[PDB]
Amino acid sequence: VHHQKLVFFAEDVGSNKGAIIGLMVGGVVIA
Amino acid sequence: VHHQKLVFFAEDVGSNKGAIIGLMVGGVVIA
Amino acid sequence: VHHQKLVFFAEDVGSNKGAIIGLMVGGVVIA
Amino acid sequence: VHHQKLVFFAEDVGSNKGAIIGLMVGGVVIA
Amino acid sequence: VHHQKLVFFAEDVGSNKGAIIGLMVGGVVIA
Amino acid sequence: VHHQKLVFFAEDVGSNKGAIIGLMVGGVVIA
Amino acid sequence: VHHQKLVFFAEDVGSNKGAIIGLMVGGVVIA
Amino acid sequence: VHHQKLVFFAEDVGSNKGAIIGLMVGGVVIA
Amino acid sequence: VHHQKLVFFAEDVGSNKGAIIGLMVGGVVIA
Amino acid sequence: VHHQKLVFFAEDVGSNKGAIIGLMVGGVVIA
Numbered sequence: 001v002h003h004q005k006l007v008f009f010a011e012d013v014g015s016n017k018g019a020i021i022g023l024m025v026g027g028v029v030i031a
Numbered sequence: 032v033h034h035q036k037l038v039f040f041a042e043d044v045g046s047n048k049g050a051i052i053g054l055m056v057g058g059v060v061i062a
Numbered sequence: 063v064h065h066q067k068l069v070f071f072a073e074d075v076g077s078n079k080g081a082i083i084g085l086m087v088g089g090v091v092i093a
Numbered sequence: 094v095h096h097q098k099l100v101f102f103a104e105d106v107g108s109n110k111g112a113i114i115g116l117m118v119g120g121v122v123i124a
Numbered sequence: 125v126h127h128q129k130l131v132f133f134a135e136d137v138g139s140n141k142g143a144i145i146g147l148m149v150g151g152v153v154i155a
Numbered sequence: 156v157h158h159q160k161l162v163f164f165a166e167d168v169g170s171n172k173g174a175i176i177g178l179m180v181g182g183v184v185i186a
Numbered sequence: 187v188h189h190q191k192l193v194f195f196a197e198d199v200g201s202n203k204g205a206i207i208g209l210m211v212g213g214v215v216i217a
Numbered sequence: 218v219h220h221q222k223l224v225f226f227a228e229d230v231g232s233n234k235g236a237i238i239g240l241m242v243g244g245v246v247i248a
Numbered sequence: 249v250h251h252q253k254l255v256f257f258a259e260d261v262g263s264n265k266g267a268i269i270g271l272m273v274g275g276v277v278i279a
Numbered sequence: 280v281h282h283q284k285l286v287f288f289a290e291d292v293g294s295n296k297g298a299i300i301g302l303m304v305g306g307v308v309i310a
Contacts, residue, residue: 001032001063005070006053008036014046015076016111017172017203017234018062019093020083021050022068022099026058027088027117031050031080047080048172048203053068058086063094067101077107078142079203079234079265081124082114084099084130089119089148093111094125098132108138110234110265110296112145112155115130120150124142141265141296156187160194167197171204171235174217177192177223182212182241186204193224201231202266205248206238208223208254213243213272217235224255233266233297236279239254239285244274244303248266255286263293267310268300270285275305279297 006022019031037053050062068084081093099115112124130146143155161177174186192208205217223239236248254270267279285301298310 003034003054003064003068004066005036006034007038007051007069009040009044009071010073011040011043012073013044013071013075015079016082017046017048017079019050019060019081020047020069021052021060021086022084024052024055024058024060024086027086027090028058029060029081029083029086029091031062031093065094065096065099067098069100071102072104074104075102075106077110078113079110081112082100083117084115085096086117089117089121091112091114091117091122093124096130097128100131102133102135105135106133106137108141109144110141112143113131114145114148116127117148120148120152122143122145122148122153124155158192159190162193164195165197168195168199170200171202171206173204175193175204175206176210177208179210182210182214184205184207184210184215186217188219189223190221191225195226196228198228199226199230201234202237203234205236206224207241208239210241213241213245215236215238215241215246217248218249220251220254222253222256226257227259229260229262230257231262233264233268235266237255237266237268238272239270241272244272244276246267246269246272246277248279249280251282251285253284253287257288258290260290261288261292263296264299265296267298268286269303270301272303275303275307277298277300277303277308279310
């Protein structure tokens, strides 16, 4: 099994006020 | 099995206030 | 298993006020 | 397993006021 | 098991007023 | 003319990611 | 003319990531 | 004309990552 | 014309990472 | 014209990592 660039951005990102996760297996995230 | 660029953006993204996840297997996300 | 560049940004990022996580297995994050 | 470059930035980052984590296994983070 | 460059920055970082952690196993961080 | 408590909250507010304005006369708001 | 308590909160506010304005007459706000 | 307590908080405020303005007449705010 | 207590906090404020302005007439603020 | 207590805090303030301005007429602030 091989994972790569699971989430890809190719230009500007203004701002992030939420959650950006690549691989989510467990735990709690509150953004 | 091979995963790659599961979510692809090709221009500007204004802002993110929600959730952007590539591969979601378990756990709790609250955006 | 091999993991690589799970979250990839290719241009400017204005600001981050939330969470940017690569591989989320456990624990609690509050952004 | 061989983890590498789990979170990759390729240009300027304006500012960070939240959390940037590479591999999250346990504990509590409050940003 | 071999970890490497878990969080990678390739250009300028303006400022950091939050948390930048490479591998988070336990304990409490409040930024 | 008298204005008083134009927007009233009486319990907890979880989070706000939009706009909460009391009296809107002019200008541009983008939330 | 008299303005008083144009926006009223009576309990806890979790977090604010948007705009909270009392009296908006002109100018540009981007939250 | 008399302005008084245009934005009123009566309990704890967790955090602010946006804009809290009382009287907005001109200029540019980017939070 | 009389201005008084344009923004009022009555309990603890956890942290501020944005802008808290009382009377905004001109200029540029980037938080 | 009389200005008085344009921004009022009545309890503890944890920390400030942004801007707290009373009367903003001109100039540039980057927090």
